[PDB]
Every structure is written in structure tokens, then in C-alpha cells.
Amino acid sequence: NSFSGYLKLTDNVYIKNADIVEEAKKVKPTVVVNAANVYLKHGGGVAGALNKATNNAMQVESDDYIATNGPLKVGGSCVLSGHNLAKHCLHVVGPNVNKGEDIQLLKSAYENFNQHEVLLAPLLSAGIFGADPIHSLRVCVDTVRTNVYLAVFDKNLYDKLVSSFL
Numbered sequence: 747n748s749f750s751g752y753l754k755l756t757d758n759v760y761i762k763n764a765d766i767v768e769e770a771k772k773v774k775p776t777v778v779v780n781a782a783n784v785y786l787k788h789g790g791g792v793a794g795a796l797n798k799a800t801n802n803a804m805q806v807e808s809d810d811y812i813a814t815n816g817p818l819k820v821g822g823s824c825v826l827s828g829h830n831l832a833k834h835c836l837h838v839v840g841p842n843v844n845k846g847e848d849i850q851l852l853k854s855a856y857e858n859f860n861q862h863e864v865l866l867a868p869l870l871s872a873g874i875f876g877a878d879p880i881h882s883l884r885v886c887v888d889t890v891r892t893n894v895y896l897a898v899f900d901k902n903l904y905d906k907l908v909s910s911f912l
């Protein structure tokens with residue numbers, strides 16, 4: 747958990763302009779959060795990048811989890827191995843608002859972070875899931891009560907988030 751170069755936005759939310767994969771390799775946190783889908787198929791966005799950095803070990807493990815437990819619910823999560831990136835990976839499913847899933851479930855998705863004291867995480871539902879990234883940061887700030895270090899890999903978006911937050 748040796749986080750460097752973060753900006754503190756609130757008592758418990760920190761933000762950095764970095765690829766979450768590079769942060770995980772440098773820090774080796776206790777928990778890295780994945781922005782997953784209900785079948786844990788890590789095909790693109792943050793999920794594809796984290797799985798690629800484990801050389802598909804995350805996908806093989808996720809397929810075994812689904813074989814034994816079935817899919818997650820939207821707003822739900824599971825804890826799996828973090829492989830070479832972290833001790834654990836918290837896979838969290840935010841709503842895919844572009845497919846009519848209710849944005850109210852973004853609060854349920856961020857509530858899963860509260861089971862862990864410290865996490866390295868991305869913005870949920872802000873990739874191909876279509877939610878406004880500044881709205882996603884507002885829900886994170888209003889819902890997460892443990893210590894969360896957010897990595898955002900787009901400088902243009904990082905600057906808009908810091909300006910809107912202060």
C-alpha cells in the first residue's frame with residue numbers, strides 16, 4: 747500500500763492520473779478493484795488490462811468461480827486472487843446504464859468497497875458502461891467510507907475531476 751503522488755479529495759478518497767495496472771505493479775496493494783461484468787469476462791477496459799497483466803491467470807480463475815457459483819448480480823462483488831498485482835482482486839459490477847441498468851445500482855456497487863480498509867480502484871461504470879465519470883466520482887465520495895485510492899488513466903478526465911472536486 748505505498749501509494750505515491752495522489753491528491754487527497756476527501757477524508758478517505760485519493761486520486762492519481764495513472765494506469766491502475768502500473769499502480770498495482772508498483773504498490774502490490776492488499777486489494778485491487780476490477781470493474782467487472784456479471785460473468786467475469788475480462789475483454790476490455792480496465793478488466794481486460796488487469797487480466798492481460800496477469801497473462802490470463804485472472805480469466806482462468808474467474809471462469810472456475812462462475813462454474814461453481816454462477817454469475818454475480820449487478821451491484822454485487824466477489825473476492826478472488828490478485829495474482830501478481832495484489833493480494834486480492836475485488837471484482838465489482840457497476841450498472842451498464844447504456845443497456846438500461848439502473849444508475850441507482852452504482853451506490854450498491856461502491857458499497858462493496860466498504861468491506862476492505864484500503865483499496866486501489868478505478869471509476870465504476872465509467873468505461874463502456876456509459877455512466878458520466880464525474881457522477882461516478884460523486885457516488886464514490888458519498889458511499890465509500892474506507893480508504894480508496896483511485897487511478898484514472900486519462901489526463902483530460904483527471905483534470906475535469908480535480909476541477910469539479912477541488
Ligand SMILES: CC(C)[C@@H](Nc1ncnc2[nH]ccc12)C(F)F
Pocket residue numbers: 764765766767791792795868869872873879897898899900903
Ligand atoms: C474507467 C475509465 C473512465 C478510465 N480507464 C482506466 N482508468 C485507469 N486505469 C486504466 N487502465 C486501463 C484503462 C483504465 C479512463 F482513464 F479511461
